[PDB]
Amino acid sequence: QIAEFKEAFSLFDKDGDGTITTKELGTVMRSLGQNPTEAELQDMINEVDADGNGTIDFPEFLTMMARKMKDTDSEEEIREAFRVFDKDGNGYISAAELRHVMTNLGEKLTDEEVDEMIREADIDGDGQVNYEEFVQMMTAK
Amino acid sequence: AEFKEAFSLFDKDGDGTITTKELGTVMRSLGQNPTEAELQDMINEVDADGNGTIDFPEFLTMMARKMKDTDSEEEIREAFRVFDKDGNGYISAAELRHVMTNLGEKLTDEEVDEMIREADIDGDGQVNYEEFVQMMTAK
Amino acid sequence: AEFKEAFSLFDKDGDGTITTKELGTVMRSLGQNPTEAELQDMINEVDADGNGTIDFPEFLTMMARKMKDTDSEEEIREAFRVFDKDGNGYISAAELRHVMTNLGEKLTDEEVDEMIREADIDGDGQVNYEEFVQMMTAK
Amino acid sequence: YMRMRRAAITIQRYVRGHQARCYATFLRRTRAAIIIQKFQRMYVVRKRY
Numbered sequence A: 001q002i003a004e005f006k007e008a009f010s011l012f013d014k015d016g017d018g019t020i021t022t023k024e025l026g027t028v029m030r031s032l033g034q035n036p037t038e039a040e041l042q043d044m045i046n047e048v049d050a051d052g053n054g055t056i057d058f059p060e061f062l063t064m065m066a067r068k069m070k071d072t073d074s075e076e077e078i079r080e081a082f083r084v085f086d087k088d089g090n091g092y093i094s095a096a097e098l099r100h101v102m103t104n105l106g107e108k109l110t111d112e113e114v115d116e117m118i119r120e121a122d123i124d125g126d127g128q129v130n131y132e133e134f135v136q137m138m139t140a141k
Numbered sequence B, C: 001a002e003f004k005e006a007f008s009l010f011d012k013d014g015d016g017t018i019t020t021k022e023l024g025t026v027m028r029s030l031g032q033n034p035t036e037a038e039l040q041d042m043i044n045e046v047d048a049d050g051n052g053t054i055d056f057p058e059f060l061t062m063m064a065r066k067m068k069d070t071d072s073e074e075e076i077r078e079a080f081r082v083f084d085k086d087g088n089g090y091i092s093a094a095e096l097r098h099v100m101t102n103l104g105e106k107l108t109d110e111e112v113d114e115m116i117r118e119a120d121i122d123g124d125g126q127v128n129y130e131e132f133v134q135m136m137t138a139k
Numbered sequence D: 001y002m003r004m005r006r007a008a009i010t011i012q013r014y015v016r017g018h019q020a021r022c023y024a025t026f027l028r029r030t031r032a033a034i035i036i037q038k039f040q041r042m043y044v045v046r047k048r049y
Helices: A002-010 A022-032 A038-045 A058-074 A095-104 A111-117 A131-139 B020-030 B036-044 B056-065 B067-074 B093-101 B109-115 B129-138 C004-010 C020-030 C036-044 C056-065 C067-072 C093-101 C109-115 C129-137 D005-048
Strands: A019-021 A055-057 A092-094 A128-130 B017-019 B053-055 B090-092 B126-128 C017-019 C053-055 C090-092 C126-128
Touching (some): A022 A055, A022 A058, A022 D005, A095 A111, A095 A128, A111 D005, A128 A131, A131 D005, B020 B036, B090 B093, B093 B126, B126 B129, C017 C020, C020 D005, C053 C056, C056 C067, C090 C093, C126 C129
Antiparallel strands (some): A019 A055, B090 B126, C090 C126
């Protein structure tokens, strides 16, 4: 709980001012455990207090988490998913496909996000990824 | 209505190409409601004769060549019959299944059985086809 | 924590100045614990740009300017990881050497080989890192 | 289509959580190395003097 989250906050305070930039709200939620939308963050970054704020303290954030807890908890439920990219049912997809799914589809990610992600993803010498293992690793927590 | 993002949802191999047989679903994922016939005519008027897959450039050229016929397939908003001549506003479930599964580019019975789930049927055995056409499109 | 007597043990010659590269060792002689990075930042935020040596007044002004960051380095008494996640309480000598010689402000292999003298190693090849951190500091 | 884009969007959220946590774990590993290297260098100089 709060002891590791406070250390996570103290690694997001860089300056040491007790407060972190309001822009880094989504990354701090993600660091603790959650997986919220950038929209969901916008819908709860707004306030009259934190909308006006340039930086947020750990008491403020703890208050925001308490208010939005149910919605915030809802974004750790998923553990299963389906894709495609394999039609033949190999169970494997290329790194090229995975990049195309992530950067051209849905809520498009950047290449730098995908490159950051393939530092914690098993990739064989062929250049393919077992997507059943990959879904287990990304939900692993 | 070209969309590279939509192509990339159908390129599932990052290969750059999609199977020629997924051309009708890609048009109907973009927008466009083409017939299966119009789709075959569009493929057949290119020497894509031996082509197993299509790239986004090829698909772009076909939509530009046939833009007028394809655009016509998102003008419509209402749909009359030519069943019903009495003008009762009703059609039997038997006629409705026959027009769907026997005429034209035939739906399967399983697709028709899906469409008539929840659809009210009177004691004559007839369905309000105006409500039925609104329910299948407005959703 | 300024100490003129400690400065007079770094000054050996009695010139009144010590080399700007002995700044980290003088801070650490005193009681402080600054990173090699923090030591460079402290020098770089003064136009001691061309300065080959520092006097005791200059060193005093730098410690007073940076008292808060420098004091922080003598708060800590315990040390966690983040290497272990299983919570076995054990880390391989390979991972211990890697964190020491490959991450951060790298130790030499000869420095690490000194600290693993008299350090027990099991048949898995792992060392109790709690005992190892205590044995290094509590001496 | 509007259902299957909602498998891509959800995974895109979970990956954004995964990367941030991984980035944080790596920073904690580098920070843990710097502090201990530092404790050693403060201690090693003081012993000798």
